[PDB]
Amino acid sequence: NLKADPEELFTKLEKIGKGSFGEVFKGIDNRTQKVVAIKIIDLEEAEIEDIQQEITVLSQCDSPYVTKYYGSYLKDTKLWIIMEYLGGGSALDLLEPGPLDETQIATILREILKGLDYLHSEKKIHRDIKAANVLLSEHGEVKLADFGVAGQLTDTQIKRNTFVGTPFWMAPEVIKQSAYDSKADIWSLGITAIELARGEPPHSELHPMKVLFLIPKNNPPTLEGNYSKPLKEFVEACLNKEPSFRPTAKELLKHKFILRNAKKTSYLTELIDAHHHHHH
């Protein structure tokens, strides 16, 4: 039962961003000398082998719209998750210089939807859709990241009222821990569309415990301000309190906002340029 040491298997390089449940680093697989991303989760207070088994299952996923998993390695109380590295920045990173235009939003949402359609067709739930987990390559390709595990890391805490993580993107049925399915991602997608349009999810000025309380009780958010009627309607379609009333990802790919505004992903290199200029 002697475990491989991830610090020997991988060279941890610079931090590249805050992930859910842990910081994310660029890394090198020392066996292949290939670049990877590494997220280290501290599981001192927690079923570890169930999470590793599911990461192994998810490492078999294969889609242009979803980052690869490359397994995970436990070291004492820390779980090293190994992932495909993308270097363009997350959509959250790329929101820093200023507002996105509706073509950028529609392009990014279209790619997210294709990734959600893939995961849902494989009977998986992303469960952590937010701009921070939407990644760009240096060429503008868009892939979902950190999918398929957040439920194992949070659902029990939510049941016990011991969850202290961030609630802004959670569907009401996830907060109430009733039966939830892929439609939970569709709610989170609607919140993420607001985040891409306005820079932050609804209720971002409120205490997270008030937000956890509000989401299942309040009318769902809507997109307010100078935004096109199709974009507002796309948001409204996602943000229905009843999950059976939300459309599937496959249906949303046909939404007129997506079809009339999405353009080539290669144009999103302009967004990466803006980040460079912002930080130059």
Ligand X SMILES: O=C1NCCCCCNc2nc(c3ccccc3n2)Nc2cc1[nH]n2
196 is in an annotated binding site: no
Q: Looking at 77-85, 195-203, 218-226, 256-264, which segment touches ligand X (CB under 6 A)? A: 77-85
Q: Give the separation between CA 237 and CA 75, rounded to whole angstroms.
A: 44
Given candidates 82, 86, 91, 105, which one binds ligand X under the rule CB under 6 A?
86
Given candidates 133, 154, 182, 261, which one binds ligand X under the rule CB under 6 A?
133
142 phi, psi to nearest 5 deg: -120, 130
Minimum Å distance from CB 57 to ligand X? 17
Q: Looking at 84-92, 106-114, 236-244, 248-256, which segment touches ligand X (CB under 6 A)? A: 84-92
Decide if residue 115 touches ligand X (CB under 6 A). no
86 is in an annotated binding site: yes
Decide if residue 94 touches ligand X (CB under 6 A). no
147 phi, psi to nearest 5 deg: -95, 155
Q: How would you class 257 by CB atoms within 10 Å of its CB: exposed for 0-12, middle for 13-18, buried for 19 or more?
A: buried
- Classified as helix, coil or strand, 195 is helix
Q: Catalytic annotation on 128?
A: yes
Q: Which is nearer to ligand X, 72 or 133 (CB)?
A: 133
245 is in an annotated binding site: no
Please name which of 218, 257, 254 lies closest in space to residue 239, comparing C-alpha atoms: 218
Decide if residue 142 touches ligand X (CB under 6 A). no
Q: Give the separation between CA 135 and CA 143, rounded to whole angstroms.
A: 5
What is the crossing angle of helices 48-58 and 150-159, to 10°? Answer: 140
Which residues are near ligand X by CB under 6 A? 16-17, 19, 24, 37, 39, 67, 83-87, 89-90, 93, 132-133, 135, 145-146
Q: Residues annotated in the binding site for Mg(2+), as ranges?
A: 133, 146
